[PDB]
Tab-separated table of C-alpha atoms in Angstrom:
chain	number	residue	atom	x	y	z
A	14	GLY	CA	0.984	77.851	47.076
A	15	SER	CA	-0.036	79.396	50.391
A	16	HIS	CA	-1.344	77.167	53.163
A	17	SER	CA	-2.954	77.521	56.565
A	18	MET	CA	-3.703	75.422	59.634
A	19	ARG	CA	-6.721	76.091	61.856
A	20	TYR	CA	-8.281	74.490	64.875
A	21	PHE	CA	-11.962	75.128	65.552
A	22	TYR	CA	-13.214	74.671	69.113
A	23	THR	CA	-16.916	74.708	69.998
A	24	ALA	CA	-18.086	74.546	73.630
A	25	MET	CA	-21.830	74.322	74.178
A	26	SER	CA	-23.681	74.414	77.511
A	27	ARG	CA	-26.980	72.558	77.854
A	28	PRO	CA	-28.479	73.050	81.330
A	29	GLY	CA	-30.270	69.921	82.544
A	30	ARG	CA	-28.579	67.724	79.933
A	31	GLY	CA	-25.154	67.204	81.418
A	32	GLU	CA	-21.951	69.228	81.288
A	33	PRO	CA	-21.060	71.396	78.282
A	34	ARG	CA	-19.959	69.506	75.174
A	35	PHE	CA	-16.524	70.407	73.804
A	36	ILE	CA	-15.608	69.510	70.225
A	37	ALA	CA	-12.363	70.358	68.424
A	38	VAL	CA	-11.520	69.767	64.769
A	39	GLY	CA	-8.285	70.528	62.942
A	40	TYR	CA	-7.863	71.552	59.305
A	41	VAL	CA	-5.054	72.147	56.876
A	42	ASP	CA	-6.615	74.444	54.250
A	43	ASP	CA	-9.917	72.728	53.353
A	44	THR	CA	-8.881	69.301	54.581
A	45	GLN	CA	-10.015	68.222	58.052
A	46	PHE	CA	-7.460	65.953	59.725
A	47	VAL	CA	-8.417	65.385	63.406
A	48	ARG	CA	-11.405	65.485	65.708
A	49	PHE	CA	-12.130	65.261	69.415
A	50	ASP	CA	-15.610	65.122	70.955
A	51	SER	CA	-16.205	65.069	74.719
A	52	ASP	CA	-19.520	63.335	73.994
A	53	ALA	CA	-17.852	60.334	72.358
A	54	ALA	CA	-18.247	57.052	74.245
A	55	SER	CA	-14.507	57.047	74.899
A	56	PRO	CA	-13.334	60.580	74.074
A	57	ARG	CA	-10.010	60.620	72.272
A	58	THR	CA	-8.380	62.433	69.393
A	59	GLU	CA	-9.123	60.576	66.156
A	60	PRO	CA	-7.550	60.842	62.687
A	61	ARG	CA	-9.692	62.197	59.866
A	62	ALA	CA	-7.141	62.241	57.013
A	63	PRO	CA	-4.888	59.359	55.889
A	64	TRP	CA	-1.633	61.351	56.144
A	65	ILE	CA	-2.008	62.007	59.895
A	66	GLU	CA	-2.374	58.287	60.730
A	67	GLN	CA	1.403	57.794	60.675
A	68	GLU	CA	1.724	59.952	63.803
A	69	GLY	CA	2.659	57.798	66.802
A	70	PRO	CA	0.796	57.093	70.096
A	71	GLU	CA	2.712	59.926	71.742
A	72	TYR	CA	1.038	62.376	69.337
A	73	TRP	CA	-2.473	60.987	69.878
A	74	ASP	CA	-2.044	60.975	73.639
A	75	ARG	CA	-0.672	64.525	73.622
A	76	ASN	CA	-3.662	65.755	71.600
A	77	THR	CA	-6.047	63.880	73.864
A	78	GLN	CA	-4.547	65.476	76.997
A	79	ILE	CA	-4.822	68.918	75.397
A	80	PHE	CA	-8.466	68.497	74.411
A	81	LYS	CA	-9.490	66.933	77.747
A	82	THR	CA	-7.882	69.872	79.537
A	83	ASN	CA	-9.630	72.324	77.203
A	84	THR	CA	-12.918	70.511	77.819
A	85	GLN	CA	-12.636	71.349	81.517
A	86	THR	CA	-11.403	74.928	81.015
A	87	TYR	CA	-14.207	75.783	78.555
A	88	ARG	CA	-16.782	74.620	81.060
A	89	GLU	CA	-15.321	77.130	83.517
A	90	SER	CA	-15.268	79.769	80.752
A	91	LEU	CA	-18.945	79.160	79.972
A	92	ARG	CA	-19.793	79.669	83.656
A	93	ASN	CA	-17.726	82.846	83.648
A	94	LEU	CA	-19.330	84.347	80.541
A	95	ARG	CA	-22.858	83.570	81.713
A	96	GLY	CA	-22.012	85.761	84.694
A	97	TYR	CA	-20.320	88.484	82.640
A	98	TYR	CA	-23.625	88.955	80.821
A	99	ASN	CA	-25.876	88.525	83.880
A	100	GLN	CA	-27.576	85.580	82.168
A	101	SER	CA	-29.803	83.026	83.897
A	102	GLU	CA	-28.713	79.423	84.365
A	103	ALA	CA	-31.611	78.433	82.115
A	104	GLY	CA	-30.227	79.029	78.665
A	105	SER	CA	-27.768	77.256	76.417
A	106	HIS	CA	-24.673	79.178	75.331
A	107	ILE	CA	-21.752	78.658	72.990
A	108	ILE	CA	-18.097	79.711	73.039
A	109	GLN	CA	-16.189	79.289	69.761
A	110	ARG	CA	-12.492	79.687	69.094
A	111	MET	CA	-10.725	79.553	65.734
A	112	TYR	CA	-6.948	79.931	65.639
A	113	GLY	CA	-3.944	79.029	63.562
A	114	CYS	CA	-1.208	80.163	61.239
A	115	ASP	CA	-0.906	81.144	57.578
A	116	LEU	CA	2.188	80.415	55.475
A	117	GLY	CA	3.117	82.134	52.222
A	118	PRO	CA	4.238	80.237	49.110
A	119	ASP	CA	7.809	80.096	50.472
A	120	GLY	CA	6.680	78.384	53.668
A	121	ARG	CA	7.355	81.388	55.907
A	122	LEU	CA	4.850	82.702	58.458
A	123	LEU	CA	2.478	85.208	56.879
A	124	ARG	CA	0.398	85.835	60.020
A	125	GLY	CA	-1.297	84.175	62.997
A	126	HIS	CA	-4.971	84.200	63.986
A	127	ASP	CA	-6.749	83.674	67.299
A	128	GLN	CA	-10.377	84.779	67.577
A	129	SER	CA	-13.222	83.885	69.910
A	130	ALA	CA	-16.994	84.317	69.848
A	131	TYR	CA	-19.861	84.009	72.311
A	132	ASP	CA	-23.298	83.013	71.044
A	133	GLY	CA	-22.199	83.698	67.475
A	134	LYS	CA	-20.824	87.229	68.028
A	135	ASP	CA	-17.194	88.427	68.108
A	136	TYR	CA	-16.000	88.347	71.726
A	137	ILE	CA	-12.232	88.715	71.858
A	138	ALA	CA	-9.470	88.507	69.251
A	139	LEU	CA	-5.681	88.568	69.219
A	140	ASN	CA	-4.457	91.390	67.009
A	141	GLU	CA	-2.123	90.739	64.097
A	142	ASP	CA	0.794	91.817	66.304
A	143	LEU	CA	0.195	88.661	68.375
A	144	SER	CA	0.657	90.866	71.437
A	145	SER	CA	-2.495	92.888	72.033
A	146	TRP	CA	-6.216	92.182	72.212
A	147	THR	CA	-9.427	93.550	70.783
A	148	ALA	CA	-12.470	93.080	73.054
A	149	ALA	CA	-15.952	93.449	71.618
A	150	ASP	CA	-17.700	94.728	74.728
A	151	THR	CA	-17.349	95.317	78.481
A	152	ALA	CA	-17.745	91.620	79.223
A	153	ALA	CA	-14.881	90.742	76.863
A	154	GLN	CA	-12.836	93.466	78.606
A	155	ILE	CA	-12.904	91.306	81.740
A	156	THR	CA	-11.418	88.441	79.780
A	157	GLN	CA	-8.898	90.880	78.236
A	158	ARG	CA	-7.781	92.119	81.649
A	159	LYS	CA	-7.499	88.542	82.918
A	160	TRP	CA	-5.453	87.498	79.878
A	161	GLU	CA	-3.269	90.583	80.063
A	162	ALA	CA	-2.573	89.854	83.736
A	163	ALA	CA	-1.606	86.261	82.916
A	164	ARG	CA	0.522	87.161	79.850
A	165	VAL	CA	-1.682	84.944	77.710
A	166	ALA	CA	-0.827	86.719	74.452
A	167	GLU	CA	2.796	85.681	74.894
A	168	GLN	CA	1.714	82.037	75.066
A	169	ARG	CA	-0.449	82.394	71.947
A	170	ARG	CA	2.370	84.109	70.040
A	171	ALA	CA	4.883	81.430	70.997
A	172	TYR	CA	2.586	78.734	69.645
A	173	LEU	CA	1.564	80.589	66.459
A	174	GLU	CA	5.138	81.373	65.400
A	175	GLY	CA	6.500	78.100	66.726
A	176	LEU	CA	4.706	74.738	66.956
A	177	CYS	CA	1.920	75.943	64.647
A	178	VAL	CA	4.185	76.595	61.658
A	179	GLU	CA	6.482	73.659	62.418
A	180	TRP	CA	3.632	71.150	62.488
A	181	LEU	CA	1.845	72.723	59.509
A	182	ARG	CA	5.027	72.310	57.442
A	183	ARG	CA	5.277	68.692	58.622
A	184	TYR	CA	1.681	67.947	57.590
A	185	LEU	CA	2.182	69.682	54.251
A	186	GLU	CA	5.128	67.378	53.529
A	187	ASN	CA	3.436	64.194	54.776
A	188	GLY	CA	0.276	64.957	52.800
A	189	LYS	CA	1.982	66.631	49.843
A	190	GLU	CA	0.291	64.451	47.211
A	191	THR	CA	-3.082	65.905	48.234
A	192	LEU	CA	-2.500	69.024	50.369
A	193	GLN	CA	-0.198	70.495	47.744
A	194	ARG	CA	-2.285	69.391	44.776
A	195	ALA	CA	-4.801	71.794	43.269
A	196	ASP	CA	-7.546	70.024	41.292
A	197	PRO	CA	-9.126	72.303	38.692
A	198	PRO	CA	-12.901	72.618	38.253
A	199	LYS	CA	-14.624	70.532	35.627
A	200	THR	CA	-17.033	72.938	33.993
A	201	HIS	CA	-20.071	73.142	31.743
A	202	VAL	CA	-23.009	75.393	30.904
A	203	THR	CA	-26.611	74.189	30.934
A	204	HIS	CA	-29.656	75.835	29.361
A	205	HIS	CA	-33.287	75.638	30.589
A	206	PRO	CA	-36.063	77.739	29.091
A	207	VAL	CA	-38.239	79.370	31.784
A	208	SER	CA	-40.831	80.704	29.343
A	209	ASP	CA	-41.245	81.550	25.662
A	210	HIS	CA	-39.101	84.614	26.151
A	211	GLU	CA	-36.473	83.780	28.796
A	212	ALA	CA	-34.066	80.963	29.593
A	213	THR	CA	-31.712	80.083	32.459
A	214	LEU	CA	-28.026	79.631	31.770
A	215	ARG	CA	-26.231	77.805	34.581
A	216	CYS	CA	-22.437	77.663	34.827
A	217	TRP	CA	-21.173	74.618	36.738
A	218	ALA	CA	-17.849	73.944	38.445
A	219	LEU	CA	-17.321	70.458	39.891
A	220	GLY	CA	-14.537	68.390	41.421
A	221	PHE	CA	-12.257	71.270	42.441
A	222	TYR	CA	-9.842	71.623	45.376
A	223	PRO	CA	-9.263	73.807	47.295
A	224	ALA	CA	-12.667	75.415	47.839
A	225	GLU	CA	-11.630	78.968	46.814
A	226	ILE	CA	-13.061	79.750	43.401
A	227	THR	CA	-14.450	82.645	41.413
A	228	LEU	CA	-17.423	82.008	39.165
A	229	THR	CA	-19.100	84.893	37.306
A	230	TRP	CA	-21.406	85.737	34.399
A	231	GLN	CA	-20.764	88.627	32.007
A	232	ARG	CA	-23.114	90.118	29.428
A	233	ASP	CA	-21.337	91.852	26.511
A	234	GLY	CA	-18.237	91.768	28.717
A	235	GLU	CA	-19.855	93.469	31.754
A	236	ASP	CA	-20.167	91.711	35.148
A	237	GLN	CA	-23.739	90.711	35.992
A	238	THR	CA	-23.366	90.735	39.765
A	239	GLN	CA	-26.888	91.757	40.692
A	240	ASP	CA	-28.560	89.479	38.130
A	241	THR	CA	-26.541	86.374	38.990
A	242	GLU	CA	-27.771	83.633	41.293
A	243	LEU	CA	-24.767	82.121	43.077
A	244	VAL	CA	-24.939	79.182	45.428
A	245	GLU	CA	-22.531	78.738	48.297
A	246	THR	CA	-19.536	76.557	47.442
A	247	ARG	CA	-20.417	73.089	48.748
A	248	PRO	CA	-18.482	69.907	49.623
A	249	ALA	CA	-18.936	66.832	47.416
A	250	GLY	CA	-17.778	64.377	50.091
A	251	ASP	CA	-14.709	63.191	48.204
A	252	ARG	CA	-12.521	66.153	49.244
A	253	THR	CA	-13.660	68.252	46.266
A	254	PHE	CA	-16.113	71.155	46.058
A	255	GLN	CA	-18.934	72.276	43.771
A	256	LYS	CA	-20.456	75.602	42.781
A	257	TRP	CA	-22.761	77.083	40.197
A	258	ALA	CA	-23.812	80.538	38.985
A	259	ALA	CA	-27.031	81.181	37.025
A	260	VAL	CA	-28.521	84.052	35.055
A	261	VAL	CA	-31.870	84.435	33.319
A	262	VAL	CA	-31.467	85.805	29.825
A	263	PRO	CA	-33.732	86.888	26.973
A	264	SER	CA	-34.329	83.988	24.577
A	265	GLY	CA	-31.961	84.411	21.631
A	266	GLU	CA	-29.411	86.527	23.526
A	267	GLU	CA	-27.596	83.480	24.913
A	268	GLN	CA	-24.349	84.085	23.047
A	269	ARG	CA	-23.926	87.526	24.597
A	270	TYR	CA	-23.279	85.819	27.930
A	271	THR	CA	-19.958	84.401	29.117
A	272	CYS	CA	-19.103	82.443	32.240
A	273	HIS	CA	-15.683	83.087	33.758
A	274	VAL	CA	-13.865	80.747	36.094
A	275	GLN	CA	-10.741	81.368	38.132
A	276	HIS	CA	-9.170	78.642	40.271
A	277	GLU	CA	-5.724	77.816	41.642
A	278	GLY	CA	-5.790	74.579	39.665
A	279	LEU	CA	-6.279	76.496	36.405
A	280	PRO	CA	-3.209	77.876	34.590
A	281	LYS	CA	-5.404	80.345	32.729
A	282	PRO	CA	-8.924	81.503	33.656
A	283	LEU	CA	-11.694	79.886	31.635
A	284	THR	CA	-14.306	81.637	29.544
A	285	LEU	CA	-17.300	79.446	28.720
A	286	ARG	CA	-20.475	79.884	26.725
A	287	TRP	CA	-23.548	77.791	26.210
A	288	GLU	CA	-22.853	75.354	23.373
A	289	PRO	CA	-26.211	74.189	22.011
B	25	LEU	CA	-0.791	70.141	66.529
B	26	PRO	CA	-3.116	72.272	68.687
B	27	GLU	CA	-1.943	74.902	71.184
B	28	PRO	CA	-0.387	73.165	74.177
B	29	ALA	CA	-2.529	73.273	77.298
B	30	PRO	CA	-0.516	72.210	80.362
B	31	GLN	CA	-2.774	70.880	83.134
B	32	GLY	CA	-3.681	73.495	85.746
B	33	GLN	CA	-2.089	76.289	83.708
B	34	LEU	CA	-4.865	77.146	81.244
B	35	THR	CA	-6.285	80.635	81.808
B	36	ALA	CA	-10.058	80.549	81.455
B	37	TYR	CA	-12.052	83.297	79.760
C	23	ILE	CA	-29.628	86.316	68.013
C	24	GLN	CA	-29.978	83.245	65.807
C	25	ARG	CA	-29.284	82.359	62.179
C	26	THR	CA	-31.398	80.008	60.077
C	27	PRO	CA	-29.793	77.264	57.980
C	28	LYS	CA	-29.150	77.455	54.282
C	29	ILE	CA	-29.861	74.089	52.648
C	30	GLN	CA	-28.533	72.457	49.464
C	31	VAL	CA	-29.457	68.971	48.260
C	32	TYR	CA	-27.273	67.415	45.558
C	33	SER	CA	-25.210	64.415	44.484
C	34	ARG	CA	-21.479	63.807	44.907
C	35	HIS	CA	-21.213	62.800	41.256
C	36	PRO	CA	-23.315	63.843	38.263
C	37	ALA	CA	-26.510	61.801	38.489
C	38	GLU	CA	-26.993	58.808	36.204
C	39	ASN	CA	-30.011	56.550	36.666
C	40	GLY	CA	-29.136	53.060	37.847
C	41	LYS	CA	-25.655	54.129	38.966
C	42	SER	CA	-24.653	54.246	42.647
C	43	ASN	CA	-23.772	57.695	43.960
C	44	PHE	CA	-23.955	59.771	47.146
C	45	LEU	CA	-26.891	61.992	48.098
C	46	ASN	CA	-25.773	65.072	50.039
C	47	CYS	CA	-27.546	67.570	52.198
C	48	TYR	CA	-25.343	70.512	53.132
C	49	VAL	CA	-26.621	72.765	55.888
C	50	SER	CA	-24.695	75.922	56.652
C	51	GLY	CA	-24.911	79.487	57.916
C	52	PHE	CA	-26.822	78.458	61.028
C	53	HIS	CA	-26.485	79.295	64.741
C	54	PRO	CA	-26.757	77.846	67.313
C	55	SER	CA	-25.341	74.448	66.348
C	56	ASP	CA	-28.184	72.064	67.270
C	57	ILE	CA	-29.926	70.946	64.098
C	58	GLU	CA	-31.939	67.973	62.868
C	59	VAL	CA	-31.429	66.671	59.340
C	60	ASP	CA	-33.155	63.733	57.674
C	61	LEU	CA	-32.674	62.471	54.157
C	62	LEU	CA	-35.904	61.209	52.595
C	63	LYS	CA	-36.567	58.621	49.902
C	64	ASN	CA	-40.121	58.933	48.588
C	65	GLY	CA	-41.055	60.835	51.727
C	66	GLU	CA	-39.628	58.301	54.176
C	67	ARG	CA	-36.572	58.744	56.415
C	68	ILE	CA	-33.436	56.993	55.180
C	69	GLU	CA	-31.682	55.055	57.966
C	70	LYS	CA	-28.053	55.470	59.032
C	71	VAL	CA	-27.229	58.680	57.185
C	72	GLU	CA	-23.719	59.852	58.144
C	73	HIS	CA	-22.562	63.417	58.713
C	74	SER	CA	-19.375	65.473	58.964
C	75	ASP	CA	-17.899	66.700	62.240
C	76	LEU	CA	-19.248	70.037	63.432
C	77	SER	CA	-17.171	72.986	62.279
C	78	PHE	CA	-17.799	76.599	61.412
C	79	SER	CA	-17.090	79.406	58.965
C	80	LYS	CA	-15.277	82.720	59.500
C	81	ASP	CA	-18.526	84.450	60.448
C	82	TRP	CA	-18.969	81.819	63.223
C	83	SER	CA	-21.939	80.116	61.543
C	84	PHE	CA	-21.965	76.312	61.581
C	85	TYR	CA	-22.007	73.863	58.690
C	86	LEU	CA	-22.554	70.102	58.320
C	87	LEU	CA	-22.716	67.649	55.425
C	88	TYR	CA	-25.194	64.782	55.706
C	89	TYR	CA	-24.723	61.971	53.209
C	90	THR	CA	-25.796	58.509	52.204
C	91	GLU	CA	-25.255	56.072	49.352
C	92	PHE	CA	-28.071	56.094	46.798
C	93	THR	CA	-28.829	54.952	43.285
C	94	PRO	CA	-30.984	57.496	41.501
C	95	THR	CA	-33.744	56.299	39.225
C	96	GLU	CA	-36.284	58.082	37.060
C	97	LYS	CA	-39.172	57.909	39.524
C	98	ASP	CA	-37.638	57.873	43.032
C	99	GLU	CA	-37.911	61.233	44.822
C	100	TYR	CA	-35.254	62.389	47.266
C	101	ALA	CA	-35.290	65.273	49.705
C	102	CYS	CA	-33.657	66.770	52.768
C	103	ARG	CA	-35.737	67.719	55.807
C	104	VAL	CA	-34.258	70.184	58.267
C	105	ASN	CA	-35.358	71.481	61.649
C	106	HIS	CA	-33.639	74.177	63.712
C	107	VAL	CA	-34.654	76.496	66.540
C	108	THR	CA	-35.206	79.231	63.915
C	109	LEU	CA	-37.819	77.161	62.045
C	110	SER	CA	-41.474	76.898	63.115
C	111	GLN	CA	-41.724	73.597	61.267
C	112	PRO	CA	-39.339	71.313	59.362
C	113	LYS	CA	-38.172	72.686	56.041
C	114	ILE	CA	-38.042	70.259	53.107
C	115	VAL	CA	-35.845	70.780	50.078
C	116	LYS	CA	-36.273	68.334	47.194
C	117	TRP	CA	-33.328	66.928	45.279
C	118	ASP	CA	-33.216	68.428	41.806
C	119	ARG	CA	-30.423	67.015	39.651
C	120	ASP	CA	-30.063	70.398	37.881
C	121	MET	CA	-29.306	72.258	41.125
């Protein structure tokens, strides 16, 4: 299948409570594999998936240098952005960055990503060309001009097409038994009357990986988008994910409703009904 | 592996 | 601008009374990242709950999983109690094994 690597950086100021915290986590698809936290007692890059543990001390030290350097640079960046928005030194602010590469099923680069946010809003992003920028506002334009002057895009491109795909492929091979295994959802339909004249049908999907899934109800073969209650896909804690979709139906019409499930781990989509 | 970040080189926002 | 957390309380495995399991509280969709999450057993804070490392979704909102070992029984009540800058007071969501 297709696979991606992402790193997620969060830098958070906290005036009066020390210097800004910097935390980085790395993922392959929906599997986290490293973390770094400047607030740790002894900050260092730590493994968070078994297949990354085989990397040698050189790797851990390299990561640790990178994240310690970022920790310092993001503190400067937070100072800079506070000033770009004329903000007081009183408030707490957050810079986020998410970046990485996507591979297609043949292992070739599909595209790179590099986006940043300030206080939860788009700030600046690298365009799909990996050569030009999109700035959200006049403050982000200052960053854009600074990064254009320093040929930053060229650095990002070199990483996204280079080390990013090379290391992602390495991880995919080292963790192939899990990273390249799709576990299908285990499914069932439950039934709970809500009154004499209505009942809830809930369609469950459990134990699936990766997180991407489509779960829908149909009535007489028509999608029930507006009438369906969907919960956000949620982690089980064992690598797998869970989701349900529910609809309230007239008592006695239960068999007119079908639950449909699509998932990478499924050869053919499922159609399920309540089975009293 | 994250984007390399050579000491002193990193361009801030 | 700020975003209030969504909250789900559920078990890792399908619940079976008398069988050890994990109680989860997943908070997501929130911003900024500071958040307080307690798991409750019969209204009292459970000690030493663990949580995932802070990360975030494509819309920049944060998510965290809080979890602890538990053995559900017929009468024990479990809940998740969340506070965030967006909330005037802690929000409590009870564990319902059908949800």
